[PDB]
Point group: D2
Chain length 427, copies 4
């Protein structure tokens, strides 16, 4: 009836945690999630889309390579590992990541699907957390009791403030695939934003720009179509060492950095930029292309015209000028935002909050005052750019398991980098 911990969302981070926590003698854990199964970014799962991270950043390998949930074992189980060996590609197709997480989810015993947690509270008598769910299929109430909670509810698709009207006219990157036909039949399309999502889509639509007749535009507030910096000395910043350093900085300094370091976690894989460019070059060989590409351009307002068009007021923040552009179809590749879910109100008072009323996460990813309520991927403001990285999932899950059980279930490296991040006098 009582669990050592209850894990509240089931995305890749909690799924990881589940695969890691299943084999631990003396640990009862359970993971709730409101959907019927694992399905991860179904709407940006393009046929030629792959992860930004090598396959060793699967569910378990960075913490335990021997785990049967490893992507390589997965491959062995489907009798295709030898083909994966021949492929010799560190980067899984997103479709395969998904098929693999699904496999892991079927195999696990600790997951409870179709279970929407509606409310969470602290019972002062019992000294434990009380989690109220609703079966999404049947209505049934349940309560789940646990000493510790970990939240990986995920963040949520975000569109600019000035577009909550018109929402039914545009498509947010996340829904791109469902609406891809509806878009290609328009005569002009525009993608708004410069993240990897934005780029994969822009590439997708370019592939067919002379199959259909469209104009393909790309506008963003970002100064450049920048690459995710992936050179090996910078990849050391993704390390326990660096997280310590970053966590220990002043809280303004962190937020300051997180907006200044967007090229460490938000940019476009550099092969794709180049592929896009090479494709514009190839397409141009037939005749001039109807493409427009703008930079430094914030969407300040939009409006819907009579004939069946948008008019996008933008503002060029570097040369301080405003301007107007129009487009039949629109793809809002503006990314995602966390917001503490509804249920958190019930424990809301027991969670520590910072000046901006966000979780005041501690180095061990705890938000309560007693190391029982943890978060996954709500720490961008407090642990830095490494927070959403599937390749630091095992590391977090390992510091979690160390807090939840008393002990270092999975060894957690203290430093792996050749460089030294903070100031350190010699002697």
């Amino acid at each position: 009836t009582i669990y050592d911990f209850i894990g509240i969302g089931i995305g890749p981070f909690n799924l990881g945690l589940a695969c890691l926590s299943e084999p631990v003698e003396g640990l009862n854990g359970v993971f709730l999630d409101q959907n019927p199964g694992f399905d991860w970014h179904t709407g940006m799962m393009l046929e030629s889309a792959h992860l930004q991270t090598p396959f060793m950043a699967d569910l378990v390998t960075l913490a335990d390579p021997t785990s049967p949930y490893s992507l390589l074992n997965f491959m062995k189980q489907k009798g295709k590992l030898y083909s994966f060996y021949i492929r010799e590609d560190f980067f899984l197709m997103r479709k395969e990541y998904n098929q693999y997480c699904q496999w892991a989810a079927e195999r696990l015993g600790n997951l409870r699907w179709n279970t929407r947690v509606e409310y969470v509270s602290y019972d002062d008598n019992l000294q434990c957390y009380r989690v109220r769910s609703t079966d999404t299929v049947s209505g049934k109430q349940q309560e789940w009791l646990a000493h510790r909670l970990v939240l990986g509810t995920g963040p949520s698709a975000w569109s600019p403030a000035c577009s909550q009207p018109y929402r039914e006219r545009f498509v947010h990157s996340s829904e791109y695939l469902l609406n891809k036909e509806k878009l290609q039949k328009k005569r002009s399309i525009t993608v708004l934003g410069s993240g990897q999502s934005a780029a994969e889509i822009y590439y997708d639509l370019l592939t067919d720009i002379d199959r259909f007749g469209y104009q393909l535009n790309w506008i963003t507030r970002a100064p450049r179509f920048y690459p995710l910096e992936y050179t090996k000395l910078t990849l050391e910043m993704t390390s326990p060492e660096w997280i310590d350093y970053f966590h220990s900085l002043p809280a303004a300094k962190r937020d300051e950095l997180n907006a200044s370091q967007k090229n460490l976690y938000k940019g476009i894989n550099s092969s794709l930029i180049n592929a896009i460019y090479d494709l514009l070059y190839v397409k141009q060989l037939d005749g001039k292309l109807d493409v427009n590409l703008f930079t430094h351009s914030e969407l300040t307002d939009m409006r819907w015209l009579a004939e069946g068009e948008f008019e996008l007021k933008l503002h060029q923040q570097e040369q301080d000028r405003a301007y107007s552009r129009r487009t039949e179809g629109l793809v809002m590749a503006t990314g995602y935002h966390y917001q503490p879910p509804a249920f958190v109100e019930g424990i809301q008072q027991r969670i520590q909050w910072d000046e901006k009323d966000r979780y005041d996460v501690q180095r061990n990813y705890s938000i309560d005052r007693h190391n029982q309520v943890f978060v996954q991927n709500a720490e961008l403001h407090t642990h830095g750019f490494v927070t959403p990285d599937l390749g630091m999932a095992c590391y977090r899950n390992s510091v979690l398991l160390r807090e939840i059980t008393g002990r270092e279930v999975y060894p957690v490296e203290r430093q792996i980098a050749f460089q030294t991040f903070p100031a350190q006098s010699e002697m």
Copy 2:
């Protein structure tokens, strides 16, 4: 005393693998013997820069069982450095690290007996099992081991063309290179004979220092071209169970005019290195003509050591059907390795099937005997082709060995890999 299910004689990579795959198999009682005091693998051609030509998934166990604790990835984890390796992002291990990894695996195993020279092996009719006579090399103690089955991975040995036996005191085989590098760099002139990978790693190493010491640096080989090892992915399907079960459709040794015909599938230099070699000649040449020669299609038929203080190499340019001669003080004979049955095998001579040439006439499941109990690792260049020296096909073979030794599939064996169909097949 007790009769082992199998004994493995020789702890090369192939038996070291079979050891790690054997260890945790329930009711398998087997043991591995080797002379050497621990694991080492050709420490005298192992240059700072060298590395394996296969991805790291062709480690001791992973292509049969990714969950094994003897996996490379796990070694890396246990050593404290998997994040660094994740940053490295390189399918190819440095030969020195493969070496440390194997040593760590061997130190962790329990089924290996080091310092155990095998002197003689016989079949004990009266007991109906094999009798293996060993010397403990550190005590001197003789000892006898009983086994129903033997798996021999003794490994091949350093080889030079017949015509060179008299000068073996002076020329240095590739295995002896690092130990004489300093010696050879003092000569006026060095020549590197043979155009496999060993030769090229060396030729590159020496070219590096050519502007710095005297020398003339020559490269001569019998081969037609300095050909690359064919690494295109359609062709690696031929290193697969399907292609090996295809190769088991008897041309009864017209598979042997195939084995010299399919030269560039298992011999041949790494593409990168060939190009590296070229780019280096280019860079050195920016300072002057390079005293280099590079010949090709040339069999070394005779050799002599002039009173002058130089070799004279008699070469036969085989395509032009024309003979020539060249000279050289230093001489690195990069002509490979060849398998001869060890001493201890006279003891079961009459028990072993022989090929018309006194090669083990290896059966399809790797047995040399009549009753499926004496097996061999990589003495089948003639029976299984270009694929017998590949660390990638190690787990496949060890898996079929354990099906035979055990009677049951222990590690499944992926036959659903190749897109190609290899045999004729009708519709």
Copy 3:
């Protein structure tokens, strides 16, 4: 009225020769061709197809980088060189090569289109060649007199002997693009052969294998889907040095080699093999693919069935078995064959012939007995695998111009390779 030389075809080789010969003081040359303009392999000109050779193997640069016909100048003239610089890709799209040769052809003054030469003779009185043309548009006869002739009439699309019936049912690689729609609407397609043409098409059709419903088969007589060997030490074989060596071999030995060295000039760009494999892997993620891929399989016969199908009798030459396969659509990527054109009869007697009744080409590409009748790309049997290489076009054109004018108009390197090809004794 009289020309120093008349150039009979206008493909890339004679077009090159034309750009090179135009600026030479004291040289009157003229190039006839029966089509209305330059259009080069229109039917294999896929959108993502590019040359196998870097852009410095354009019309002129390997002989004169300062020529205004250089691909880079071309780029400058269209005001897009800075974009070509950003692209940083040595390999022109085939579409761009074409647009560029067309540009060069407009610019030239020495080309005569719509002129089919029907007959050629030696006038014994005049001591010169007499070339009879027909204007393809208007019927008009003309005669052109020249001292020397050079023939770059091109080779011709070839299909296996056993298919001259059925010719109207299949598509030869050369016509692929016109018939691409007609093929994609079939339910099964097969490509016959393993050259670069075969591969580009197989890739093309795979891109859409789940857009349409087809089965995509690939069958070839070749042992493997082999790569064109492009490693830099082998690329030295494409050199004056090597051609000397090769030309000087016995004529059986050459033919022998030309069939043994098909991987030097006939194979698939290795990126494409791998791309094809990666695409089979990606496509397979959705469900098993209806693809079949056969090797060592000669098409011995074919026949057309009632319902609307082919039945291809093949013969697996390695395991000596015949078999039968069927396919609605068929793409015959069997390449091309030279045959001396009709007009050569008129000079036929003055040309030297070899044992097999092919031009007995001399080192300077002459076929007459007096160094006045030259060929371009009819020397495979006598100059080797480098014959069709656009990157040796400038070299040939340069030895031609040296013979035609008295003198070395464009310097012709005697050796550029670090290695030495023939036997060469030291002293």
Copy 4:
């Protein structure tokens, strides 16, 4: 005597370019003066392995005129080696070859005067032209040159932080490195200060030999990361006339908080090298912990030379706002180059427009004067941005210089390049 249309003072690459582009222009009478006895370009940071970060098309002339005989490709042809370079297939020239190429261009030009130190420059009111006073360095002879216009490409000079002036006798700037390599490798400890490309080429060079000599090898820089130079193709559009004519929309020096903000577009290390550096640390570490440190975000504020026999470096970790100190025997100060106006320019001080800081307030066509007749090469880091030190934008500038010097477009100037639109623009 005669008054030149322009005189160029300093024969760096930029004026060497303008020389080659100027030479064949009809009715342009101009000449170039330099002290040095011939061309050399920083011979003491030029390591066997170094190479340019730009493709070879950014040679002296090709981006303005591919037909020029001063093109690299033509140099390669004239030297007898273009086939080798075609085999090399490498957009990036070795720094030693760029050097030989420029020297060959300069030896072939007629408009350069070497050994011609320019002592003083004045405006002769009475003649209405500029007066340039020179010393012939080999005769001693004073001499005076007249010119309507001056183009100054004197080049910047080696720079160290202010706080180091006292120890300049002991530490070695990157320019002096090869000459003290042997000296520095004898020390216990070496430190490399600065994280541009120079630093990295050096840091790599030294790491190479780290296992071989004593040393501790440190790397410290002010920069936040060891960032790569941004080479993604969408971003190289910003190095283009369009982006430079965009940059000519006055923020009147808010383009100066851009110039430190756009650090990684023109400073920053080659991607490959960063990774190379990492892979080498990895390989060396296979033998032991490496005595290396690498610090970042650290301004060198003070420095001192202890009696002990060591420097003590006072560093300020700027992000952590914390001071520290480190020590080192050897010290390579890889801190770059800075432009100060030369001596001879006092002579036209009142004639030159100055930026509020005594920098030439460079006008849009590169003029420093009021009457469009004194021009400058690469003293505009503030007026034209990240693009002023790029050999790729050399031909662009020399082309606009020759429009001004000449009144007519001599070499067109490609403004139809970028797919991006850079300024705001409405629809």
